[PDB]
């Protein structure tokens with residue numbers, strides 16, 4: 523990923539807010555030199571992505587994790603809101619399209635996590651916390667978790683580098699920008715909100 | 726990606742339909758044993774993903790493409806609708822959460838494309854065709870596209886293998902499935918529509 527200056531994160535906390543808000547991530551590694559990816563829920567331990575630790579799990583029948591000893595460099599991609607920008611919105615002739623989006627790329631070394639039960643219980647709490655009501659596992663469900671454990675492989679990524687893209691049209695002048703934002707406000711309110719947050723000076 | 730049989734595509738054209746409906750893809754390669762990914766619009770040439778050809782473009786100032794020159798294997802991930810499934814929706818105890826989603830992974834050899842104008846113009850046509858209304862490039866915009874070409878790098882992927890995941894709660898019993906579909910109907914209609922199409926014929 524390459525990040526033009528206009529699409530850099532405005533504030534250092536924005537990468538971590540995106541990661542926490544979008545836990546269904548893409549875990550990418552090199553299996554015999556070719557890329558392989560698994561969609562998995564991944565949570566963040568720590569205040570910042572860079573230097574932080576990611577915790578995830580996948581199916582033990584998914585052979586992807588068997589590579590995590592011989593090829594330990596991994597990339598985890600977290601994806602926020604996104605949307606196509608049609609030249610129709612600009613209302614200018616000569617124009618060209620683009621796609622607006624925010625994403626965080628965390629690269630580091632992967633390792634298997636012995637305490638798989640901890641990883642999945644922490645994932646439950648993190649993903650249920652924004653919901654009302656939140657689901658809290660009963661004793662019967664924690665016992666069920668224990669019965670399920672042979673089928674899971676948990677893992678940790680110690681994040682060495684992070685890269686964040688907030689490609690949200692901030693290069694546009696106000697008239698073309700207003701038109702982009704108004705088009706997303708109707709059909710993609712999450713993206714419009716991200717655009718609003720990208721313009722903040724402090725909060 | 727590992728695809729359990731009950732989350733496989735029900736019809737062989739469903740993978741191609743997902744690719745065409747979700748063209749903003751993730752293009753992944755190995756730049757010195759480390760995975761590097763770029764988000765880019767990618768379209769499908771052919772009736773099927775496997776054996777088909779993917780066409781995309783990225784920023785020439787994005788150094789990612791410089792690793793394509795040796796024609797390494799690339800992975801292109803197309804992601805459809807997705808949504809978290811909270812056990813609250815099941816309304817049954819012993820339970821555990823999951824995440825429902827559909828995605829297509831295409832792996833093959835990447836080639837730099839000399840015909841970058843054709844790639845970007847075909848991408849325009851493919852992305853605009855279902856919008857209402859569709860944008861129709863004017864002669865001025867076609868001349869603009871030519872002027873922009875130095876700044877773009879286009880590429881082809883010959884798809885050697887493909888995996889398609891339609892993880893859409895097909896394994897739930899009838900009462901729990903209905904709860905999940907009903908819950909997504911309200912807050913994620915694109916995902917609910919995908920579940921409907923997964924059970925049809």
Ligand code: HEM
Pocket residue numbers: 560561562563579580581582584642643645646647649666667668670671673674727809821822823824
């Ligand atoms: C907290 C939210 C959770 C989410 C969003 C989630 C999601 C997922 C996903 C997407 C997969 C597929 C991974 C792959 O393709 O390799 C998976 C696999 C698996 N997860 Fe989780 N999971 C959650 C919690 C749990 C808990 C608490 C357990 C208890 C041990 C668990 C046990 C498993 C097992 C056994 C599998 C293997 C496939 C299966 O049996 O369904 N998960 N999970």
Ligand code: HEM
Pocket residue numbers: 524606618619620621763764765766782783784785787845846848849850852869870871873874875876877
């Ligand atoms: C059809 C829908 C299109 C979409 C969704 C789209 C989207 C994008 C995206 C996401 C990037 C950044 C890639 C990166 O990070 O490396 C990009 C770069 C670029 N695209 Fe496209 N594009 C489209 C059509 C076109 C057309 C017709 C042209 C005409 C030549 C063009 C020219 C460029 C150029 C010059 C760049 C690099 C410089 C820049 O980003 O402004 N694109 N495009």
